[PDB]
Amino acid sequence: VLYVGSKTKEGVVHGVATVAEKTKEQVTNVGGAVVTGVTAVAQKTVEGAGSIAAATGFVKKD
Amino acid sequence: VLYVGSKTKEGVVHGVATVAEKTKEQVTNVGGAVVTGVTAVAQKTVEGAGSIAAATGFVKKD
């Protein structure tokens, strides 16, 4: 009863990736990263949020 | 009963990627990133939100 968010399989396969084959250079710059798997919460009398996930950041070339 | 968000399979396969074959350079810049799998919440008396997911950021070249 109430299988909320359950019985998953491969929730995410690559996220932030640089997949390739037969290359010669594979830089990968991610700055600040938070990678998690399952994030289950269970509340009863909330007055804020249940789960927040913010991501702020920029990229300058020159 | 109430299989909300359950029995998934490959929720997301690439997210933010740079897939290729037979290249010679594969930079990947992501700034600040939050990659998660399952995000299940279960509340009873909410007064805010259930799950927030903000993403702010820019990209300057020169």
Place this chain on the structure above:
Amino acid sequence: VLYVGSKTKEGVVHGVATVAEKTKEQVTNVGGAVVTGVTAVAQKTVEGAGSIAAATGFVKKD
């Protein structure tokens, strides 16, 4: 009853990766990173949040 966020399998397979085959250079720069598996919380009288996950950061090339 209430299988919230349970019975998962491979919550995330690569997160932040640089997968490849037959390359010659595989730099990977991640700055500051927080990698976790299961993040289960269970509250009763919340007045803030249930689980926060912020990620801030940038990438400068030159």
